[PDB]
Ligand SMILES: [Cl-]
């Protein structure tokens with residue numbers, strides 16, 4: 193298992209514009225286009241992102257290109273983040289993937305707010321951090337996925353995904 197496979201499982205693949213769980217225009221593998229209610233805004237955003245006249249649809253290759261870009265952006269964001277970098281450096285490989293997953297989903301900024309969970313991951317207090325993470329909107333809105341990421345943190349294995 194690896195991050196890509198991991199996220200592929202959590203986000204799915206869709207070649208046509210679609211709305212996320214929060215109602216936002218998205219495409220490919222979890223690629224948020226816009227928070228705006230307009231499909232046009234979304235459509236515009238999309239074309240700008242592919243570099244072509246898409247019409248709300250993309251190819252698989254296009255979806256993967258975007259995905260590669262996003263994961264890379266995420267790793268770089270964490271490494272660049274004063275609050276995230278240390279947590280990250282402090283972790284093992286599997287758990288690192290779990291932090292990347294959250295960041296991909298909620299942004300550096302949203303993850304950075306899990307001040308408490310973070311301190312706990314840093315101290316290697318697995319069960320405690322798991323419970324703390326569970327006390328969140330995140331958990332309450334996307335429980336299954338949340339649970340998958342959380343187990344990953346608690347155990348350090350890919351069991352949740354197998
Ligand atoms: Cl809560």
Ligand SMILES: [Cl-]
Pocket residue numbers: 333334335336337338
């Ligand atoms: Cl879910």
